[PDB]
Design brief:
By secondary structure, this protein is of the alpha/beta class. Helices cover 33% and strands 26% of the residues. The protein has three domains: 80 residues, SH3 type barrels (Roll), CATH 2.30.30; 121 residues, Rossmann fold (3-Layer(aba) Sandwich), CATH 3.40.50; 61 residues, Guanylate Kinase phosphate binding domain, CATH 3.30.63.10. The chain contains eight helices and 15 strands. The relative contact order is 0.16. The structure holds guanosine-5'-monophosphate (5GP).
Length: 264
């Protein structure tokens, strides 16, 4: 048969319908029917056509074909959503031998106490930086104050090829760039269940910051759900943290599922 990854979670009606969650990889055994396919998590599941029809009438993400490949590098990590900074900080602190950060590039002048190749790869001219960016040398870049900063493909590769998970502090836009560079990341979205939930997973921030965080999360999910490797939720940060680690463990290893060429 073939394999697909669910991009959504699936009246009181009982049937042989298989339940699944976002990110589950499914082994499709029989897809001859246009409405229901026979499958098993790696019952029946609604076909792409059926999911789309229902969603359209309700008011589209359904599934994407995937294939298993062997990788010899450690997958970079991109944690997104509320509390991601604490999660990034804690992973780096908890497993010094398994997680690391890459060295970013920048055009700003190096301070006297900074070291080139350690703090940043300090670029001589901004023109050179822009050229490399145009040459697709960066997974992501931006401007702060009046200087450029960027996470280069090579800097990430160096960490990944070394066998350690590179903790990235970049937007969801980087996922496709990393995939194309053959540095398949583990993108984890921490989804707030409500405004109240945000207030529970971070007891420090104000109600106003919480509302802003919830709004960003909503927009992030609306735009990049297809790029997430997994979506985690929890009643507390501790629960979120535990789940983030479980995902990384589950999606690590030599064999990973990546987008396939076959199309539904
Ligand atoms: N997300 C993200 N922000 C960064 C990164 N490197 C620097 N920054 C941002 O740029 C600001 C200025 O950093 P600086 O110029 O002092 O090294 C930081 O406070 C931070 O917000 C990075 O790798 N990822």
């Amino acid at each position: 048969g073939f394999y697909i990854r669910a991009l959504f979670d699936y009246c009181g009606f009982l049937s042989q319908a298989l339940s699944f969650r976002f990110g589950d990889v499914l082994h499709v055994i029989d897809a001859g029917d246009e409405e229901w396919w026979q499958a098993r998590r790696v019952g029946f599941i609604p076909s792409k056509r059926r999911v789309e029809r229902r969603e359209w009438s309700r008011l589209v993400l359904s599934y994407e074909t995937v294939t298993q490949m062997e990788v010899h590098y450690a997958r970079p990590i991109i944690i997104l959503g509320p509390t991601k900074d604490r999660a990034n900080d804690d992973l780096l602190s908890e497993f010094p031998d398994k997680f690391g950060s890459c060295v970013p590039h920048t055009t700003r002048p190096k301070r006297e106490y900074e070291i080139d190749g350690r703090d940043y790869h300090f670029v001589s001219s901004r023109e050179k930086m822009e050229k490399d960016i145009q040459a697709h040398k960066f997974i992501e870049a931006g401007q702060y104050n009046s200087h450029l900063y960027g996470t280069s493909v090579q800097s990430v590769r160096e960490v990944a090829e070394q066998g350690k998970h590179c903790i990235l502090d970049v937007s969801a836009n980087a996922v496709r760039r990393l995939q194309a560079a053959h540095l398949h990341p583990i993108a984890i979205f921490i989804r707030p269940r409500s405004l109240e939930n945000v207030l529970e997973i971070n007891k420090r921030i104000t109600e106003e910051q919480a509302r802003k965080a919830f709004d960003r999360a909503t927009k992030l999910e609306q735009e990049f759900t297809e790029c997430f490797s997994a979506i985690v939720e929890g009643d507390s940060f501790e629960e979120i943290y535990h789940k983030v680690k479980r995902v990384i463990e589950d999606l690590s290893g030599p064999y990973i599922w990546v987008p396939a060429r076959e199309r539904l």
